[PDB]
Tab-separated table of C-alpha atoms and ligand atoms in Angstrom:
chain	number	residue	atom	x	y	z
O	1	UNK	CA	9.363	22.027	13.070
O	2	UNK	CA	8.169	18.844	11.372
O	3	UNK	CA	4.469	18.653	10.483
O	4	UNK	CA	2.787	15.277	10.852
O	5	UNK	CA	-0.724	13.898	11.203
O	6	UNK	CA	-2.095	10.368	11.471
O	7	UNK	CA	-5.498	8.843	10.758
O	8	UNK	CA	-7.163	5.680	12.035
O	9	UNK	CA	-9.080	3.604	9.543
O	10	UNK	CA	-11.114	0.425	9.576
O	11	UNK	CA	-8.288	-1.994	8.758
O	12	UNK	CA	-5.164	0.073	9.426
O	13	UNK	CA	-3.642	3.407	10.326
O	14	UNK	CA	-1.972	6.042	8.159
O	15	UNK	CA	0.690	8.574	9.199
O	16	UNK	CA	1.360	11.620	7.004
O	17	UNK	CA	4.600	13.578	7.430
O	18	UNK	CA	5.615	16.802	5.666
O	19	UNK	CA	9.324	17.541	6.192
O	20	UNK	CA	10.914	20.945	5.766
O	21	UNK	CA	12.010	22.026	2.297
O	22	UNK	CA	15.038	20.081	1.075
O	23	UNK	CA	14.968	17.710	4.048
O	24	UNK	CA	13.986	14.048	4.122
O	25	UNK	CA	12.546	11.654	6.702
O	26	UNK	CA	13.606	8.164	7.735
O	27	UNK	CA	10.947	5.882	9.172
O	28	UNK	CA	11.706	3.277	11.794
O	29	UNK	CA	9.128	1.256	13.698
O	30	UNK	CA	9.827	0.727	17.414
O	31	UNK	CA	9.062	-2.413	19.370
O	32	UNK	CA	8.617	-2.266	23.144
O	33	UNK	CA	12.313	-3.134	23.626
O	34	UNK	CA	13.509	-0.084	21.685
O	35	UNK	CA	14.504	-1.868	18.478
O	36	UNK	CA	14.090	0.270	15.358
O	37	UNK	CA	12.767	-1.546	12.281
O	38	UNK	CA	13.382	-0.109	8.843
O	39	UNK	CA	10.278	-0.129	6.635
O	40	UNK	CA	10.777	-1.927	3.318
O	41	UNK	CA	8.993	-2.149	-0.024
O	42	UNK	CA	8.289	-5.899	-0.005
O	43	UNK	CA	7.830	-7.463	3.424
O	44	UNK	CA	5.464	-9.609	5.479
O	45	UNK	CA	4.893	-6.934	8.114
O	46	UNK	CA	2.011	-5.086	6.368
O	47	UNK	CA	3.589	-1.637	6.461
O	48	UNK	CA	4.448	0.598	3.514
O	49	UNK	CA	6.099	3.920	2.657
O	50	UNK	CA	4.917	6.115	-0.222
O	51	UNK	CA	5.244	9.700	-1.445
O	52	UNK	CA	2.058	11.592	-2.293
O	53	UNK	CA	1.557	13.989	-5.180
O	54	UNK	CA	2.771	16.625	-2.720
O	55	UNK	CA	6.104	16.354	-0.918
O	56	UNK	CA	4.499	14.362	1.894
O	57	UNK	CA	5.505	10.857	2.940
O	58	UNK	CA	2.755	8.326	3.661
O	59	UNK	CA	3.278	5.491	6.147
O	60	UNK	CA	0.596	2.793	6.119
O	61	UNK	CA	0.294	0.043	8.737
O	62	UNK	CA	-2.313	-2.701	8.955
O	63	UNK	CA	-3.852	-3.286	12.379
O	64	UNK	CA	-2.818	-6.960	12.129
O	65	UNK	CA	0.792	-6.146	11.214
O	66	UNK	CA	4.022	-7.033	12.977
O	67	UNK	CA	4.549	-4.349	15.613
O	68	UNK	CA	0.964	-3.205	16.150
O	69	UNK	CA	0.144	-4.055	19.764
O	70	UNK	CA	-3.108	-4.185	21.706
O	71	UNK	CA	-2.879	-2.277	25.001
O	72	UNK	CA	-5.916	-1.307	27.094
O	73	UNK	CA	-8.261	-2.210	24.234
O	74	UNK	CA	-6.645	-0.003	21.574
O	75	UNK	CA	-4.259	-0.575	18.687
O	76	UNK	CA	-0.956	1.187	19.408
O	77	UNK	CA	2.037	1.672	17.107
O	78	UNK	CA	5.214	3.616	17.914
O	79	UNK	CA	7.156	5.159	15.018
O	80	UNK	CA	10.345	7.247	14.973
O	81	UNK	CA	10.748	10.051	12.423
O	82	UNK	CA	14.297	11.055	11.426
O	83	UNK	CA	14.265	14.482	9.803
O	84	UNK	CA	17.508	14.575	7.830
O	85	UNK	CA	19.604	17.042	5.844
O	86	UNK	CA	21.002	16.376	2.380
O	87	UNK	CA	24.437	15.901	3.979
O	88	UNK	CA	23.075	12.851	5.819
O	89	UNK	CA	22.928	14.367	9.316
O	90	UNK	CA	19.910	13.958	11.588
O	91	UNK	CA	18.447	17.422	12.107
O	92	UNK	CA	15.798	16.138	14.537
O	93	UNK	CA	14.156	12.940	15.745
O	94	UNK	CA	10.468	12.647	16.608
O	95	UNK	CA	8.700	9.731	18.282
O	96	UNK	CA	5.005	9.289	17.483
O	97	UNK	CA	2.564	6.942	19.211
O	98	UNK	CA	-0.396	6.053	16.991
O	99	UNK	CA	-3.491	5.092	18.995
O	100	UNK	CA	-6.640	3.703	17.390
O	101	UNK	CA	-9.821	2.207	18.899
O	102	UNK	CA	-10.740	-1.475	18.691
O	103	UNK	CA	-13.550	-3.799	19.898
R	1	UNK	CA	-11.926	7.095	-25.502
R	2	UNK	CA	-11.614	4.737	-22.498
R	3	UNK	CA	-12.529	1.317	-23.913
R	4	UNK	CA	-10.059	-0.956	-22.123
R	5	UNK	CA	-11.313	-4.525	-21.781
R	6	UNK	CA	-10.609	-6.215	-18.454
R	7	UNK	CA	-12.056	-8.918	-16.227
R	8	UNK	CA	-11.000	-10.782	-13.111
R	9	UNK	CA	-11.180	-14.462	-12.212
R	10	UNK	CA	-11.420	-16.012	-8.753
R	11	UNK	CA	-9.244	-19.068	-8.069
R	12	UNK	CA	-8.367	-21.412	-5.203
R	13	UNK	CA	-5.470	-19.535	-3.546
R	14	UNK	CA	-5.680	-16.226	-5.383
R	15	UNK	CA	-7.360	-14.155	-8.046
R	16	UNK	CA	-6.205	-12.926	-11.459
R	17	UNK	CA	-6.942	-9.575	-13.081
R	18	UNK	CA	-6.664	-9.638	-16.873
R	19	UNK	CA	-6.355	-6.512	-18.981
R	20	UNK	CA	-6.086	-6.429	-22.774
R	21	UNK	CA	-4.780	-3.033	-23.893
R	22	UNK	CA	-5.072	-2.034	-27.519
R	23	UNK	CA	-2.927	-0.176	-30.036
R	24	UNK	CA	0.430	-0.888	-28.431
R	25	UNK	CA	-0.633	0.368	-24.995
R	26	UNK	CA	0.179	-1.088	-21.595
R	27	UNK	CA	-1.399	-1.235	-18.143
R	28	UNK	CA	0.115	-0.467	-14.752
R	29	UNK	CA	-1.752	-1.776	-11.712
R	30	UNK	CA	-2.125	0.142	-8.454
R	31	UNK	CA	-3.730	-1.132	-5.259
R	32	UNK	CA	-5.949	1.339	-3.402
R	33	UNK	CA	-6.164	1.238	0.387
R	34	UNK	CA	-8.992	2.694	2.458
R	35	UNK	CA	-7.088	6.009	2.722
R	36	UNK	CA	-6.982	6.527	-1.050
R	37	UNK	CA	-3.257	5.764	-1.274
R	38	UNK	CA	-2.052	4.070	-4.464
R	39	UNK	CA	0.543	1.270	-4.303
R	40	UNK	CA	2.012	0.395	-7.696
R	41	UNK	CA	2.309	-3.348	-8.170
R	42	UNK	CA	5.718	-4.983	-8.579
R	43	UNK	CA	6.688	-8.642	-8.278
R	44	UNK	CA	6.579	-9.395	-4.545
R	45	UNK	CA	6.350	-13.037	-3.482
R	46	UNK	CA	6.034	-12.255	0.221
R	47	UNK	CA	3.018	-10.019	-0.524
R	48	UNK	CA	1.710	-12.596	-3.043
R	49	UNK	CA	1.194	-10.388	-6.054
R	50	UNK	CA	2.849	-10.856	-9.428
R	51	UNK	CA	2.803	-9.341	-12.906
R	52	UNK	CA	2.724	-11.313	-16.144
R	53	UNK	CA	2.115	-10.800	-19.835
R	54	UNK	CA	0.458	-13.795	-21.436
R	55	UNK	CA	1.469	-15.240	-24.767
R	56	UNK	CA	-1.286	-12.954	-26.084
R	57	UNK	CA	-1.283	-9.181	-25.552
R	58	UNK	CA	-2.961	-9.458	-22.148
R	59	UNK	CA	-1.465	-8.157	-18.912
R	60	UNK	CA	-2.033	-10.338	-15.846
R	61	UNK	CA	-2.095	-9.163	-12.239
R	62	UNK	CA	-2.188	-12.115	-9.838
R	63	UNK	CA	-2.920	-11.671	-6.136
R	64	UNK	CA	-3.014	-14.431	-3.562
R	65	UNK	CA	-6.046	-14.374	-1.293
R	66	UNK	CA	-3.722	-14.179	1.719
R	67	UNK	CA	-1.662	-11.344	0.234
R	68	UNK	CA	-0.911	-8.252	2.264
R	69	UNK	CA	-3.241	-5.701	0.576
R	70	UNK	CA	-6.144	-8.180	0.551
R	71	UNK	CA	-8.940	-7.639	3.076
R	72	UNK	CA	-11.787	-9.824	4.308
R	73	UNK	CA	-15.139	-8.032	4.046
R	74	UNK	CA	-18.493	-9.824	4.438
R	75	UNK	CA	-16.713	-13.160	4.266
R	76	UNK	CA	-15.109	-12.303	0.926
R	77	UNK	CA	-11.594	-11.410	-0.181
R	78	UNK	CA	-11.623	-7.830	-1.483
R	79	UNK	CA	-8.970	-5.877	-3.376
R	80	UNK	CA	-9.570	-2.469	-4.944
R	81	UNK	CA	-7.358	-1.900	-7.978
R	82	UNK	CA	-6.784	1.045	-10.291
R	83	UNK	CA	-5.889	0.256	-13.905
R	84	UNK	CA	-3.777	2.903	-15.610
R	85	UNK	CA	-3.960	2.529	-19.385
R	86	UNK	CA	-0.639	3.921	-20.599
R	87	UNK	CA	1.202	4.684	-23.792
R	88	UNK	CA	4.810	3.561	-24.057
R	89	UNK	CA	5.821	7.185	-23.445
R	90	UNK	CA	4.511	6.816	-19.879
R	91	UNK	CA	1.357	8.953	-20.097
R	92	UNK	CA	-1.910	7.708	-18.607
R	93	UNK	CA	-4.592	7.682	-21.305
R	94	UNK	CA	-7.305	6.502	-18.885
R	95	UNK	CA	-7.828	5.200	-15.347
R	96	UNK	CA	-10.257	2.470	-14.298
R	97	UNK	CA	-11.263	1.454	-10.773
R	98	UNK	CA	-12.159	-2.203	-10.259
R	99	UNK	CA	-13.067	-3.907	-6.989
R	100	UNK	CA	-12.113	-7.568	-7.064
R	101	UNK	CA	-14.340	-9.614	-4.772
R	102	UNK	CA	-13.791	-13.346	-4.360
R	103	UNK	CA	-15.590	-15.638	-4.282
R	104	UNK	CA	-18.092	-13.938	-6.581
R	105	UNK	CA	-21.343	-12.599	-5.022
M	201	LIG	C1	10.294	1.134	-3.562
M	201	LIG	O1	10.711	1.043	-4.922
M	201	LIG	C2	10.681	2.291	-5.631
M	201	LIG	C3	11.073	1.988	-7.059
M	201	LIG	O2	10.944	0.603	-7.350
M	201	LIG	C4	11.609	3.300	-4.958
M	201	LIG	O3	11.492	4.558	-5.612
M	201	LIG	C5	11.262	3.446	-3.482
M	201	LIG	O4	12.225	4.270	-2.835
M	201	LIG	C6	11.224	2.081	-2.801
M	201	LIG	N1	10.809	2.216	-1.413
M	201	LIG	C7	11.620	1.989	-0.374
M	201	LIG	C8	13.026	1.584	-0.710
M	201	LIG	O5	11.235	2.103	0.786
M	202	LIG	C1	7.249	-11.858	-11.889
M	202	LIG	O1	6.525	-12.980	-11.398
M	202	LIG	C2	5.915	-13.772	-12.433
M	202	LIG	C3	5.142	-14.867	-11.736
M	202	LIG	O2	5.958	-15.561	-10.801
M	202	LIG	C4	6.975	-14.314	-13.395
M	202	LIG	O3	6.313	-14.972	-14.468
M	202	LIG	C5	7.840	-13.187	-13.945
M	202	LIG	O4	8.921	-13.722	-14.700
M	202	LIG	C6	8.384	-12.340	-12.794
M	202	LIG	N1	9.285	-11.280	-13.250
M	202	LIG	C7	9.024	-10.227	-14.054
M	202	LIG	C8	7.617	-10.069	-14.578
M	202	LIG	O5	9.903	-9.422	-14.346
M	203	LIG	ZN1	-7.161	13.094	9.563
M	204	LIG	ZN1	-10.343	14.351	11.327
M	205	LIG	ZN1	18.140	6.668	9.238
M	206	LIG	ZN1	4.596	-3.080	10.741
M	207	LIG	ZN1	-10.672	-15.029	-17.321
M	208	LIG	ZN1	-10.096	-26.472	-6.495
M	209	LIG	ZN1	3.420	2.894	-13.421
M	210	LIG	ZN1	2.661	-4.803	-2.231
M	211	LIG	ZN1	-0.160	6.794	-12.295
């Protein structure tokens, strides 16, 4: 159902999500112990949430952020997407693993 | 007519971006990341960027060198900023892109 796409850059990674009409998405970052971290506007962790000129939600994460790990020579970040109805119910949950090369 | 006067200064722990809008206009600052995303600037002490209006009409955007949007490129702190010259109604009269590099090349 949910459409999403992520890009690797030089200093960070970007995840674009386009939820169904009249739905919304909740972002949580996952550490290796399953904790879910809410993304906030002003924080030390070098991750952000924004809404584009279209209905899409942009998640930015710097490679040197909090929960970005190095595993087998690649930056890896796990993010959970909560597609949600206007009543507040979770319609679906998606887990995405963002992999990006590194020296 | 896009004649906004602005300049940036490099300091010891951060840099300052000064804009002097004319005719009762104001400026909103947005940081640009490498993916073209725009982050509007609000007071955030943990990200080390602040907004001020001097005793004169100038609008000040301060950014600490170790702030979260700030990158190191060729041994220099680099921040790419969009200036939105705005009327008090909220409309953007003009947009300027400035790349703040410190220390100066
Ligand atoms: C950041 O703040 C803006 C307005 O200041 C708000 O619209 C947005 O939802 C906030 N982002 C969050 C809470 O993740
Ligand atoms: C924002 O931060 C600056 C610098 O610390 C301060 O002068 C100002 O009062 C703060 N609040 C605003 C602009 O609302
Ligand atoms: Zn892409
Ligand atoms: Zn591609
Ligand atoms: Zn939630
Ligand atoms: Zn993070
Ligand atoms: Zn100056
Ligand atoms: Zn000094
Ligand atoms: Zn604005
Ligand atoms: Zn910020
Ligand atoms: Zn704008």
